Amino acid sequence: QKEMDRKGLLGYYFKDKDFSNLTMFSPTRYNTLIYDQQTANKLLDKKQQEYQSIRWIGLIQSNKTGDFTFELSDDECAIIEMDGKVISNKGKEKQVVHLEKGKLVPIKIEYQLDEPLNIDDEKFKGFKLLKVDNQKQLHQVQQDELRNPEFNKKESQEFLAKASKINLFTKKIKRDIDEGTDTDGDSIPDMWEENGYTIQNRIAVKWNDSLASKGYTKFVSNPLDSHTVGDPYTDYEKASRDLDLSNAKETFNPLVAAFPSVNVSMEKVILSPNKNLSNSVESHSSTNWSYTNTEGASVEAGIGPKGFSFGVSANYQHSETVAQEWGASIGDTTQLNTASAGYLNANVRYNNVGTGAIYDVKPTTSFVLEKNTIATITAKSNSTALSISPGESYPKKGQNGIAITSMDDFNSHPITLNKKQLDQVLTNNPIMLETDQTDGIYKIKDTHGNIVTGGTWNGVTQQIKAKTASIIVDDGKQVAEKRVAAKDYAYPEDKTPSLTLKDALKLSFPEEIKETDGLLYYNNKPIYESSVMTYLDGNTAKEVKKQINDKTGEFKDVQHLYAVKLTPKMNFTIKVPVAYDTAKQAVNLGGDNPWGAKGLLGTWVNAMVVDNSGDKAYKRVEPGYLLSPTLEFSEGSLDNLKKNYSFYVSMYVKSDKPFTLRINAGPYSTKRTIEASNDFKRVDIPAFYIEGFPIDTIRLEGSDYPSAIWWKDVSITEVSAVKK
Ligand SMILES: [Ca+2]
Numbered sequence: 048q049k050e051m052d053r054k055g056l057l058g059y060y061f062k063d064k065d066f067s068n069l070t071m072f073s074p075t076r077y078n079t080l081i082y083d084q085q086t087a088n089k090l091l092d093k094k095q096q097e098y099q100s101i102r103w104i105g106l107i108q109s110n111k112t113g114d115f116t117f118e119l120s121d122d123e124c125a126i127i128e129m130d131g132k133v134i135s136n137k138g139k140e141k142q143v144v145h146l147e148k149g150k151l152v153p154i155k156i157e158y159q160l161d162e163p164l165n166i167d168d169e170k171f172k173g174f175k176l177l178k179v180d181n182q183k184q185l186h187q188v189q190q191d192e193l194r195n196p197e198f199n200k201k202e203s204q205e206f207l208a209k210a211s212k213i214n215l216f217t218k219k220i221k222r223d224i225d226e227g228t229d230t231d232g233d234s235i236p237d238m239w240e241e242n243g244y245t246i247q248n249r250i251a252v253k254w255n256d257s258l259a260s261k262g263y264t265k266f267v268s269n270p271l272d273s274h275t276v277g278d279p280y281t282d283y284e285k286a287s288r289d290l291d292l293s294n295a296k297e298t299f300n301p302l303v304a305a306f307p308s309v310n311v312s313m314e315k316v317i318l319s320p321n322k323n324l325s326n327s328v329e330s331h332s333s334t335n336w337s338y339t340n341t342e343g344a345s346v347e348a349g350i351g352p353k354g355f356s357f358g359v360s361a362n363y364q365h366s367e368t369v370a371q372e373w374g375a376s377i378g379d380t381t382q383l384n385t386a387s388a389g390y391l392n393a394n395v396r397y398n399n400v401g402t403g404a405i406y407d408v409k410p411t412t413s414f415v416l417e418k419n420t421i422a423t424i425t426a427k428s429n430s431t432a433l434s435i436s437p438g439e440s441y442p443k444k445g446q447n448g449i450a451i452t453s454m455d456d457f458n459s460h461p462i463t464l465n466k467k468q469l470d471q472v473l474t475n476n477p478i479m480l481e482t483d484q485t486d487g488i489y490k491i492k493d494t495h496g497n498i499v500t501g502g503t504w505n506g507v508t509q510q511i512k513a514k515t516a517s518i519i520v521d522d523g524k525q526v527a528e529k530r531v532a533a534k535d536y537a538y539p540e541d542k543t544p545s546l547t548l549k550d551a552l553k554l555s556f557p558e559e560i561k562e563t564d565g566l567l568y569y570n571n572k573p574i575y576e577s578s579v580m581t582y583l584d585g586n587t588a589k590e591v592k593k594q595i596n597d598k599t600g601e602f603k604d605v606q607h608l609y610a611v612k613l614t615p616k617m618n619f620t621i622k623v624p625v626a627y628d629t630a631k632q633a634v635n636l637g638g639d640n641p642w643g644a645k646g647l648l649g650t651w652v653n654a655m656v657v658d659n660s661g662d663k664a665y666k667r668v669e670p671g672y673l674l675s676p677t678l679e680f681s682e683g684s685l686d687n688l689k690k691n692y693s694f695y696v697s698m699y700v701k702s703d704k705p706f707t708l709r710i711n712a713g714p715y716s717t718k719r720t721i722e723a724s725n726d727f728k729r730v731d732i733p734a735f736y737i738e739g740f741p742i743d744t745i746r747l748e749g750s751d752y753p754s755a756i757w758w759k760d761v762s763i764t765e766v767s768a769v770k771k
């Protein structure tokens with residue numbers, strides 16, 4: 048789309064004579080009182096661009112100090128209000144107004160026609176605003192003399208809201224909401240915000256299904272709030288893209304907040320017994336973005352009739368908190384294992400894992416090991432403040448991180464660890480990095496349309512949190528956090544549009560998430576509910592169970608986690624699978640009498656895939672005696688599993704008798720007794736990959752003959768590094 052200035056006025060073009068049925072609104076194009084026809088003609092057939100009333104609204108400044116009267120080119124049907132005063136009324140009652148050069152004052156111009164006029168009529172193209180000086184010398188008011196309303200100012204919202212409820216001709220306040228009313232003064236009529244609108248090159252129209260095929264986005268927003276998600280930008284500034292285009296493109300939707308999230312990660316982590324770092328041990332270190340949300344979580348299962356499950360953290364934290372895990376040593380640890388102190392060095396990297404651009408920030412970071420602070424980065428290490436775009440890092444990806452020993456807080460020294468602490472790091476107790484971003488700023492537009500600093504992110508963080516739910520997606524390589532519009536269903540005057548968790552994933556990940564055959568994929572990997580492991584806080588767990596358990600009211604059709612209607616301060620962490628097996632991509636071995644099934648992870652011995660009218664699942668083979676289905680992992684199928692890591696192996700299962708689910712990894716094997724179910728239910732079993740003890744098989748060991756076992760949607764998701 049065009050990057051447009053805030054010059055000219057904002058034009059409202061109505062079908063009816065009484066400013067009640069708005070057809071389109073747009074800023075006015077250079078030295079005219081009309082709009083861009085190339086864009087308008089794509090949004091609305093030329094034949095429907097015929098209007099019986101027009102309002103132009105915004106600000107005027109004179110290019111010279113003086114005493115002026117005003118007129119429209121067709122003056123007998125125009126009324127002009129300036130600074131709340133009627134200064135011309137159908138060509139009569141002209142007031143002389145003193146205007147100081149460069150001083151913007153509110154202006155509202157209204158025009159009524161006795162029959163509809165097409166925008167392409169001579170008269171429409173001819174409309175101008177004229178300024179008459181003390182000599183009765185006539186001047187067209189120039190584009191640089193005009194500005195749009197200052198959308199983010201309360202006084203401008205009051206001016207727009209008032210203009211939507213009355214007009215200068217009849218002077219009778221509207222008794223009820225119509226298709227012109229703009230209660231919150233964000234420029235977009237209440238009924239458009241509820242029922243749908245689109246904007247292209249700052250031309251806004253009501254939604255029509257003919258706009259879907261042309262690829263336009265249907266926006267909805269809260270008609271009672273100029274900032275539906277509480278971020279620095281109005282609903283209109285977001286939908287119109289009239290904001291810092293460094294913000295992520297998902298934020299050009301009123302229902303997705305612009306919100307930075309700055310964290311710090313560590314790379315090239317070493318330990319030495321020597322202060323000078325000679326004879327350092329290197330590491331297979333890992334960053335665990337969502338550690339506190341997963342490690343030690345409790346699993347709640349058997350949720351609703353579809354029997355889904357989720358994890359619950361007692362220590363839920365957002366994406367500014369990161370865990371650093373040593374992973375494993377590289378090199379001779381003989382010396383380090385006898386030492387009374389160790390010395391840690393690393394490179395650090397700042398990551399903006401949110402959707403909002405942040406400028407001039409000097410983040411503070413604590414480094415905490417088993418509740419003890421071992422280091423702090425203060426403003427002192429970033430005398431040159433940072434500016435980081437969403438999804439980017441400083442230093443940028445492909446550049447080395449910053450050595451801790453080079454940063455001013457560290458005085459050219461590594462991090463000292465006492466003997467106990469050195470053992471804690473080597474045994475995969477995490478170093479927690481918690482980062483704060485309280486001086487970082489965002490950019491806005493001032494009354495003349497200039498880019499200025501708008502304020503600190505700290506100043507908008509409360510309102511964003513109060514109006515949104517948080518979604519964190521962690522694929523074990525990077526993390527991303529989104530804040531999306533949420534609704535309090537207990538408060539009917541909260542007119543925020545309803546959004547599900549699935550709808551929110553689609554809106555907030557426009558590049559990474561696609562929907563294929565009704566299921567979401569994240570960078571071509573599964574992110575559908577049966578494939579992922581989702582972690583909640585206690586509040587969110589209670590809210591989800593309430594919606595599932597409601598069979599009759601607002602939530603009667605909520606039966607799955609991804610169908611949950613978002614409520615304020617809900618928190619979700621989604622772990623994307625590192626391996627998965629779907630019966631939809633499996634083939635039977637043995638032709639007419641199958642004995643096994645080959646899928647994405649390997650061969651299920653003593654299983655076959657069954658198609659029931661398009662619905663595929665695995666079933667245990669039934670030759671007349673008990674067998675145990677056994678997944679023989681193929682060479683390479685578990686190459687994505689981190690060493691010295693814990694996981695969940697999850698699947699949906701149904702059996703008429705109990706069975707034992709076994710993960711064989713030698714001395715690190717796990718097992719669970721699974722109760723009989725009438726319906727598929729999700730089961731989640733912990734699994735361990737300890738270096739030297741690969742995961743060899745999954746086995747479903749039955750109890751009882753005769754019986755049946757069916758399963759589908761096997762997934763493996765990361766938890767965290769295994770403590771030694
Ligand atoms: Ca509005």
Ligand SMILES: [Ca+2]
Binds near residue numbers: 268271282
């Ligand atoms: Ca609004």
Ligand SMILES: [Ca+2]
Binds near residue numbers: 595604
């Ligand atoms: Ca329900």
